[PDB]
């Protein structure tokens, strides 16, 4: 009821635990499963959605609440990834040559970002603190940056000639650019086919989990070189058959949801902080 203020909450130890709410959340929540196209191709069964829905029902979920969203690959899925379910699970196939792209995708979807628009043609942009990044997504986003000194003259580049700009992104579907803080940069972005936004990492996004299918511990969802945390929402699975992968996902849905939580930014109690 008091939505604009952060009031302290006094809890008492020894307060009896409430019964398990897993059944109630399963009955009153929606699960989205994100898988690549090759998964469906290998499975080769036009009715596999119904089979998985029935298996989830055997596991508890009502047979109208599990959604299956298909994406071509990591690169395409990274353009405006919209996750609307109460609980989102993303099966991301591992490629040894796409480590940075997978890390960027996980950073984008495993964390909450507050993004403001960017007019590279109008303003010189600066990153204030470590939580600030430049997230750009599009069909082909190429970003070059020219740092400017206190006199607004470029460093190692000329503001007039974009050829001297330092290239940081080339033909990227998604890229999270981190430059030196407290320095103004002139930006050259292929805005005609990609959008760049100035974003802050508010914190974890608890309703999105990523299962890396058949790789190693390579995701780095933090730009700090000294930290490469492996949160509970990033799992790894060895695989040969996608049917086995989906059976493992179905059978351990309890644990997968346990690793996740309702989106803190969502729901009524988050009203008037950022959203709802």
């Amino acid at each position: 009821q008091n939505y604009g203020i952060n009031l302290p909450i006094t809890g008492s130890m020894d307060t009896a635990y409430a019964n398990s709410t897993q059944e109630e959340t399963f009955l009153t929540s929606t699960l989205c499963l994100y898988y690549p196209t090759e998964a469906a191709t290998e499975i080769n069964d036009n009715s596999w959605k119904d089979t998985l829905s029935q298996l989830f029902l055997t596991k508890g979920w009502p047979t109208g609440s599990v959604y299956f969203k298909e994406y071509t690959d990591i690169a395409s899925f990274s353009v405006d990834p919209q996750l609307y379910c109460d609980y989102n699970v993303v099966l991301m196939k591992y490629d040894a040559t796409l480590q940075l792209d997978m890390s960027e995708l996980a950073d984008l979807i495993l964390n909450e970002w507050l993004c403001n628009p960017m007019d590279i043609t109008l303003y010189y942009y600066q990153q204030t603190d470590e939580a600030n990044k430049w997230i750009s997504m599009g069909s082909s986003c190429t970003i070059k940056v020219c740092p400017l000194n206190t006199q607004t003259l470029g460093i190692g580049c000329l503001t007039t000639d974009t050829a001297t700009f330092e290239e940081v992104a080339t033909a990227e579907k998604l890229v999270i650019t981190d430059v030196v803080d407290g320095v103004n940069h002139k930006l050259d972005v292929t805005t005609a086919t990609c959008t760049i936004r100035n974003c802050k990492k508010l914190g974890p996004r608890e309703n999105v989990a990523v299962i890396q299918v058949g790789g190693s511990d390579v995701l780095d969802i933090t730009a700090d070189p000294t930290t490469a945390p492996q949160t509970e929402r990033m799992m790894r699975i060895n695989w040969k058959k996608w049917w086995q992968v989906f059976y493992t996902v179905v059978d351990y849905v309890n644990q997968i949801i346990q690793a996740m939580s309702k989106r803190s930014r969502s729901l009524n109690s988050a009203a008037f902080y950022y959203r709802i």
Binding site: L153, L158, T160, D161, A163, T164
Partner: protein, 48 residues
């Protein structure tokens, strides 16, 4: 060939009237010139 003479049916363009009344022979087309020139790429100017 030149009239009233046995010198005829020779191939070429004699210097008698190469103009043939026409004031100019025209040939049009494209020409590509790969050259080397003086450009600093607007990078030799004063700092300010």
């Amino acid at each position: 060939s030149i009239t009233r003479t046995r010198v005829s049916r020779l191939y070429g363009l004699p210097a008698a009237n190469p103009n043939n009344g026409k004031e100019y022979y025209e040939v049009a087309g494209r020409f590509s010139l790969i050259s080397l020139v003086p450009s600093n790429d607007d990078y030799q100017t004063p700092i300010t």
